[PDB]
Swiss-Prot record, chains A, B:
Residues 1-147 are annotated as: Transglycosylase. In the N-terminal section; belongs to the glycosyltransferase 51 family. In the C-terminal section; belongs to the transpeptidase family. The active site is at E25. This is Penicillin-binding protein 1A. The chain holds residues 59 to 243 of 726 of the full protein. It is found in: Cell inner membrane.
Length: 177, 177
């Protein structure tokens, strides 16, 4: 098996993990149609970028190209995908394919590599750490950059708090874990 | 909802339906890697064509193009998909997106439109009918071409028999339903 090991359906994935990934990478994921116009504009201002669906598309290309052309092929695919499968399913696929450093593909493989346990056994702070990796697994890998990894984790937590996915009490406890 | 209505996970889909689709469209689906070299060659001889994974890719393009270029973009996607998700999952996705005529997308929407019931409530002969549609939903639609639809159904049954997915007794009973 290439790395197609450890697939877990959406219904067995913690609300905290889903929310951590949404708040951090595509805050308005549940409502757009593949691409986020507002996000794209609000991005120009100050970060920014793609939607979860786009990141999923980006990884369906056998090649690792980044031209402007490819970015459009991604957004078109993203849009078509959104017309074919629902949000919970897209979230499921995305979460199980995403590279999270240390040879870990998907939330499950990650939960074990980083916390010796199952994704559904993860705490809030443990979920926040996974969501902080996608941006750059190698730059924020807790194994050798526990410092950048840590602050980016608390940043995800701060994001989740702003989205209302967790309470202030829940926030204070997590950032100190 | 566009048509993203009626999604059913692989584990709730009858062995007869899966097998009917495999035997008919990608006999050696469980063992290839996205494309089937032997199938492609054995195809030239006498039919032939793509793998289930390829058909899935073909439908992730917002456009309905058929150039040689697009056929290659499909096979590359197919190959990448196979390296990302396992067979049972690919089968799940494919089966839920495939157009089967009469506005029906996926096996579920099909089971209802054609047999007023749920995919898991389908009989062997009912499963054989669904597998006969992908080739040309409009050419074999039971609603207006019950004649072509019928013989192609029995052809799927004959295929399933040859693959050993059903017994001779099971075959005789179905072709007469």
């Amino acid at each position: 098996g290439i790395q197609k090991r450890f697939y877990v359906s959406i219904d067995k994935i913690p609300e905290h993990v889903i929310n951590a990934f949404v708040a951090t990478e595509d805050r308005n994921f549940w409502h757009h149609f593949g691409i986020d116009p507002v996000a794209i504009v609000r991005a120009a201002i100050v970060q920014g970028g793609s939607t979860i669906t786009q990141q999923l598309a980006k990884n369906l290309f056998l090649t690792r190209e980044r031209t402007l052309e490819r970015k459009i092929k991604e957004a078109l695919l993203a849009i078509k995908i959104e017309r074919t499968f629902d949000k919970k399913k897209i979230m499921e696929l995305y979460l199980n394919q995403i590279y999270l450093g240390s040879g870990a593909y998907g939330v499950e493989a990650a939960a074990q590599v980083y916390f010796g346990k199952h994704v559904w056994e993860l705490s809030l702070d443990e979920a926040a750490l996974l969501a902080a990796l996608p941006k750059a697994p190698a730059k924020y890998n807790p194994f050798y950059h526990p410092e950048r990894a840590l602050q980016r984790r608390n940043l995800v937590l701060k994001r989740m708090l702003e989205e209302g996915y967790i309470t202030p009490e829940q926030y204070e406890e997590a950032v100190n874990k």
